[PDB]
Amino acid sequence: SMLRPRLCTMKKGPSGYGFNLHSDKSKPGQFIRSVDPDSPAEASGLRAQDRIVEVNGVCMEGKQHGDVVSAIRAGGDETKLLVVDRETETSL
C-alpha cells in the first residue's frame, strides 16, 4: 500500500485514457475498475481499485459517479487524477 496519494497525469489517445471508473455498492467513492494494457492510464501508474480523491486539483469528496465523470470530461484531452489505494477515514 502506498504511503501517500499518487498523481496520475494522462493525455487521451485514440481510444481515450483507457480505464473504467465505477461506484461500489458498499463504500463511498469512485474506483478504477480496470486499466487497459498499453494505455495512457497504464503509463501514468493508475491501478485497479485505486480511489479518486481529486480531479485536476479539485476535491471529489461527496461527488457521485456522474459528477466525477463530468469533472474528468471538463478537462478536455488531459486529466490529472489524485488517487489512493486504501481507506483514509474511519468513524470510531
UniProtKB/Swiss-Prot annotation:
Coiled-coil portions: none
Organism superkingdom: Eukaryota
Consequence the record notes for mutating residue 78 to K: In NPHLOP2; the mutant expressed in cultured renal cells increases the generation of cAMP by PTH and inhibits phosphate transport
Record PTM Phosphoserine, positions in chain: 15
Post-translational modification as stated in the protein's UniProt record: Phosphorylated on serine residues.
Subcellular location: Cytoplasm; Apical cell membrane; Endomembrane system; Cell projection, Filopodium
Induction details: By estrogen.
PDZ domain location: 7-87
Expression by tissue: Detected in liver, kidney, pancreas, prostate, spleen, small intestine and placenta, in particular in the syncytiotrophoblast.
Function (record text): Scaffold protein that connects plasma membrane proteins with members of the ezrin/moesin/radixin family and thereby helps to link them to the actin cytoskeleton and to regulate their surface expression. Necessary for recycling of internalized ADRB2. Was first known to play a role in the regulation of the activity and subcellular location of SLC9A3. Necessary for cAMP-mediated phosphorylation and inhibition of SLC9A3. May enhance Wnt signaling. May participate in HTR4 targeting to microvilli. Involved in the regulation of phosphate reabsorption in the renal proximal tubules.
Implicated disorder: Nephrolithiasis/osteoporosis, hypophosphatemic, 2: A disease characterized by decreased renal phosphate absorption, renal phosphate wasting, hypophosphatemia, hyperphosphaturia, hypercalciuria, nephrolithiasis and osteoporosis.
Oligomeric form and interacting partners: Homodimer, and heterodimer with NHERF2. Binds the N-termini of EZR, RDX and MSN. Binds the C-termini of PDGFRA, PDGFRB, ADRB2, NOS2 and CFTR. Binds ARHGAP17, EPI64, RACK1, OPRK1, GNAQ, CTNNB1 and PLCB3. Binds PDZK1. Interacts with CLCN3. Binds the C-terminus of PAG1. In resting T-cells, part of a PAG1-NHERF1-MSN complex which is disrupted upon TCR activation. Forms a complex with CFTR and SLC4A7. Forms a complex with SLC4A7 and ATP6V1B1. Interacts with TRPC4 (via the PDZ-binding domain). Directly interacts with HTR4.
Protein name in UniProt: Na(+)/H(+) exchange regulatory cofactor NHE-RF1
Organism for this UniProt entry: Homo sapiens (Human)
Parent-protein residues present: 150 to 235 of 358
